[PDB]
Design a binder for this molecule. Sequence first.
Ligand SMILES: NC(=O)c1ccc[n+]([C@@H]2O[C@H](COP(=O)([O-])OP(=O)(O)OC[C@H]3O[C@@H](n4cnc5c(N)ncnc54)[C@H](OP(=O)(O)O)[C@@H]3O)[C@@H](O)[C@H]2O)c1
Ligand SMILES: O=C(O)COC(=O)c1cc2ccccc2c2c1S(=O)(=O)N(CC(=O)O)C2=O
Length: 315
Amino acid sequence: ASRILLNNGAKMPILGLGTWKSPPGQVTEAVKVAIDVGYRHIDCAHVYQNENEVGVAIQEKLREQVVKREELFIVSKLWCTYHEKGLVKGACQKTLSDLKLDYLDLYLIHWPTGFKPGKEFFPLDESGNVVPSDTNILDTWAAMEELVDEGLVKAIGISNFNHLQVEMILNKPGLKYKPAVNQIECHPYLTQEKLIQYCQSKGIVVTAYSPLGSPDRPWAKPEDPSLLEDPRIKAIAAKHNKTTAQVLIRFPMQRNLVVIPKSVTPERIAENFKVFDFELSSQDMTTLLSYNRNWRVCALLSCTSHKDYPFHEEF
Ligand SMILES: NC(=O)c1ccc[n+]([C@@H]2O[C@H](COP(=O)([O-])OP(=O)(O)OC[C@H]3O[C@@H](n4cnc5c(N)ncnc54)[C@H](OP(=O)(O)O)[C@@H]3O)[C@@H](O)[C@H]2O)c1
Ligand SMILES: O=C(O)COC(=O)c1cc2ccccc2c2c1S(=O)(=O)N(CC(=O)O)C2=O
């Protein structure tokens, strides 16, 4: 099926469009095309500095009568510098105002780490470490719950939380809403079997980010593994007469994950959506799972001393 049931009774489309690194000067067209060829889920964030331009595209297609708002599944994320309980509503309203929406379908805590409030997205000391804030996951969660109760967001969840951090929330005395989603990095070089088993057994839907291995990531090194150019995965694709990207998008779909590949290239946006006409076999799945090397595109290496840094735990 094309949509997966959330704990709030709403259905979330399992294929979404990512917008990290989609330049403001190109993402409006990207979103318009995406909606034209079938995407109903758009993954956004304040820190991507393009929510205005995403909102432009959504408004144009609403006005064109291409789609209705209730058909769209729009996700955004609370950035690290806004974890203080008193800042959360404002950050959410700023996203809403940029997106020109009166609600989000899903709002995530982008990272478990809070950063010093301020204009700078990554405030650093003088030795490259992040300046943290005096915030904690549970208080931030309570502030996220308020957003649901106020009608600004239909569901809330988390991203880049390890299983102990998810458990902190789950076990919170006085919890009002469980997280609906945990959005994590996931692809054949980081297959996340243990965190995925954890989340799914707790009724939390997992969204896989960087499913193509984020070749456009800003700290890419030449020696780094490149999923899209992996000859082994290329062989799996050729056998299905699909491209490597299509294989990499279908793979999480067959693990009951949501997946959100990013493109601003109209041809690729369309191609990437054509992954409902084929099935990966059991061998394919097994083979791709076997490529795990616990390799992260997004390791937030500037925050490794932060008290809530998520990736010291095995999972
Ligand atoms: N929660 C968080 O911490 C977090 C972190 C990272 C990412 N995410 C979300 O997940 C999304 C996906 O992750 P990502 O942006 O890191 O990377 P990705 O989707 O793995 O890869 C994007 C790169 O792949 C290229 N691409 C797309 N389709 C292609 C195709 N068919 N053939 C060849 N190249 C193709 C894109 O190029 P063009 O765009 O130039 O076509 C872009 O350079 C993000 O945009 C964001 O929405 C969330
Ligand atoms: O701090 C580091 O060690 C490396 O720099 C970053 O990770 C970084 C910088 C960033 C600097 C300015 C805007 C966004 C930045 C992002 C990121 S990110 O990869 O966490 N990430 C993806 C996401 O959070 O969805 C970002 O949107």
